Design a protein around this ligand. Structure first.
Ligand code: SF4
Ligand code: SF4
Ligand code: SF4
Ligand code: NI
Ligand code: NI
Ligand code: NI
Ligand code: NI
Ligand code: NI
Ligand code: NI
Ligand code: NI
Lengths: 75, 108, 108, 108, 75, 76
């Protein structure tokens, strides 16, 4: 996934982009917001978003979108 | 000592996959995620396990194991950690071997 | 534990040949046929043996060993049993490995 | 038993490099030359050593080790030893394996 | 030998197509007849025959022909 | 390695023919170099071997009928 070589998150901790089991409510929103702040500075946000929508990636923030936001777009 | 590898083709594409780099991929996951992957794909004993069998090991439902496997695959493909995976898939290069150092020195 | 393999070229054609699958090819032959093949090609101790040496092992003439080898090669190529041989020659595919299951899951 | 090998690419060029044939290349050098090569490239313990570390092993200066390494690389490239090195770089052929003999017999 | 992927004998035992050492007389003829009955139901009989004649396969029934029948054709 | 070296006249020779033992000087060094050069000057690929050694500045050995010190002088 060629675009991935330019991802801004490449050298960051992946826990930034995936929620621990059981994380809900304010803690989940806070983590999601921090991830999206990075995506919205990333040169491949549109390619990342496209990938995640095309294959329906079931977990994680991708392309500045949460999984629930992607689900709404796909349904 | 480091040589164990497998040649695998997927479609028209060939890969050389080193056991040591597979271990590095698994080392990036949590204990439970890596354990589910090892059991599901038969990485240790060669016998891929059913969701029921894995659920029994971890004291969770079949559906929970499905969710763990699904999330783990998303993590492996995510740009924040997929570099370890690209390195695994590029095992044919012999990047990092003593042999590569020797050939660089001989061939200049 | 299953990784032992050899890269061999014959003409413009390359093969990746797994020891475990060679063992399966030999398992399809009789004990004497497999033993003659192992000695003739040096599969065990690396020293290919002459017809006289093999005759001495089995208590038969050089001509008898020639006939056994000839018949065994016809059997290996015959369509009734050659499936095992095609799978041996296709070792580069990595069909049936844990790694192939893992890559199927990652790549969808 | 003989299978240990590494796949390495240099530029667009791929090599399959057998440990047994690397040993043959090293066997052509003196004890100190082969020891400096093993240490410098990490052929034994995987840890490539500095010139100072190697100098300590051999009781000579860093400059002396640089000269030994330089001379050894000249020797390895010199046409008088080029056959042993060509055979090493041609490991993908599987020339000399039992498998090559078996495939010759099956395919005629 | 890509015709071989269609051979009718692929899933049968090879002892159908090769005689045990020393087998003579009626047992030999009987075995050969059973093999040929399969070849004559096989979609690649002509390719199998062609292979065996081209290389002079020294043992076995191939292509509906015994070794002795092939020898006569090659003479 | 895949071209001119296949024809080198020294292929399989003890490399000690073409390389001096550490610390060899004086008459022993000259005699060894003379014996090596005698072979190069019967070799079908002397010019290719010479060209290689000068192009990359091979630091040790007789190559192409030239000693290391002769090559150094040429490259200076
Ligand atoms: S858009 Fe977000 S998740 Fe995708 S590569 Fe960029 S920073 Fe990473
Ligand atoms: S012709 Fe006979 S031996 Fe040949 S593939 Fe068909 S059944 Fe088998
Ligand atoms: S010129 Fe001398 S060193 Fe070079 S290949 Fe010929 S004999 Fe060997
Ligand atoms: Ni190893
Ligand atoms: Ni090694
Ligand atoms: Ni290999
Ligand atoms: Ni193994
Ligand atoms: Ni393995
Ligand atoms: Ni081995
Ligand atoms: Ni082997």
């Amino acid at each position: 996934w060629n675009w991935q070589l330019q991802g801004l998150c490449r050298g960051m901790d992946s826990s930034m982009f995936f929620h621990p089991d059981g994380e809900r409510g304010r803690a989940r929103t806070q983590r999601e917001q921090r991830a999206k702040e990075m995506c919205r500075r990333c040169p491949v946000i549109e390619a990342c978003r496209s990938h995640a929508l095309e294959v329906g990636e079931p977990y994680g923030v991708w392309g500045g979108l949460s999984e629930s936001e992607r689900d709404l777009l796909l349904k | 000592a480091h040589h164990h590898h497998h040649h695998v083709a997927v479609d028209a594409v060939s890969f050389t996959l080193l056991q040591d780099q597979l271990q590095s991929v698994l080392d990036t996951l949590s204990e439970r995620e890596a354990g589910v992957v090892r059991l599901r794909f038969g990485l240790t004993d060669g016998q891929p396990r059913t969701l029921d069998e894995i659920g029994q090991v971890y004291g969770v439902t079949r559906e929970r194991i499905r969710q763990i496997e699904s999330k783990t695959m998303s993590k492996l493909r995510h740009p924040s950690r997929s570099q370890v995976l690209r390195d695994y898939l590029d095992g044919s290069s012999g990047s990092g071997t003593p042999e590569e150092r020797l050939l660089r020195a001989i061939f200049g």
